[PDB]
Paper text:
The mitochondrial Ca2+ uniporter complex (mtCU) formed across the IMM is the predominant channel responsible for mediating Ca2+ uptake into the matrix. The conserved Asp-Ile-Met-Glu (DIME) motif in each subunit forms the Ca2+ selectivity filter at the intermembrane space (IMS)-exposed channel entrance by symmetric arrangement of the four subunits. Indeed, we and others demonstrated that binding of Ca2+ or Mg2+ to an MCU regulating acidic patch (MRAP) on the NTD destabilizes domain self-association and inhibits mtCU activity.
Here, we re-crystallized the human MCU-NTD in the absence of divalent cations, determining a structure to 1.6 Å resolution; moreover, this structure is the highest-resolution WT MCU-NTD structure we have achieved to date in the absence of divalent cations, providing the best starting point to investigate the effects of Ca2+ and Mg2+ binding on conformation and dynamics using in silico simulations. The C-terminus (i.e. residues 166–189) is not resolved, suggesting the region is dynamic under our crystallization conditions. The central α1-helix (residues 108–118) is approximately perpendicular to the second capping α2-helix (residues 141–146). Notably, the residues that make up MRAP in human MCU-NTD (i.e. D131, D147, D148) are not fully conserved in human MCUb-NTD at the primary (i.e. D116, N132, D133) and three-dimensional (3D) structural levels. Over the 1 μs simulation time, this single Ca2+ ion underwent 95,239 total interactions with MCU-NTDWT, with ∼97 % contacts occurring with MRAP residues D131, D147 and D148 (i.e. 29,851, 29,594 and 32,478 interactions, respectively). Collectively, these MCU-NTDWT MD data suggest that single Ca2+ binding occurs preferentially in MRAP, increasing L5 rigidity, while additional Ca2+ ions interact with the central helix, destabilizing the structure. Collectively, the data suggest that an ∼10 °C increase in temperature favours MCU-NTD structural stability and decreased dynamics in contrast to MCUb-NTD, which is destabilized by the higher temperature.
Residue numbers in the entry: 74 to 165
Write the structure that this text describes.
């Protein structure tokens, strides 16, 4: 359900937000954006989000200050309220 696709060289993360049926896509800058930036953009898009967090595939919380480029080196878990998505970005 959450996909990562590069378009024009930048990662586009498409997510299903809880308040809406229509997917929402987030383009990020891997060199400047952080995990915390992405999670804040999610919260700004949907007031129905009470909790967002990103974890490693082993289940360890990823620091907010971590660069998006580092996040997208491997799979990760994105928690939105009570749903956990396994995100599998393409290797770069």
């Amino acid at each position: 359900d959450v996909t990562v696709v590069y378009q024009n060289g930048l990662p586009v993360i498409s997510v299903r937000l809880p308040s809406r049926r229509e997917r929402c896509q987030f383009t990020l800058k891997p060199i400047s954006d952080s995990v915390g930036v992405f999670l804040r953009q999610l919260q700004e898009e949907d007031r129905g989000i009470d909790r967002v967090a990103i974890y490693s595939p082993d289940g360890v919380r990823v620091a907010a200050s971590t660069g998006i480029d580092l996040l997208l080196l491997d799979d990760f878990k994105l928690v939105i309220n009570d749903l956990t998505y396994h995100v599998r970005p393409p290797k770069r």
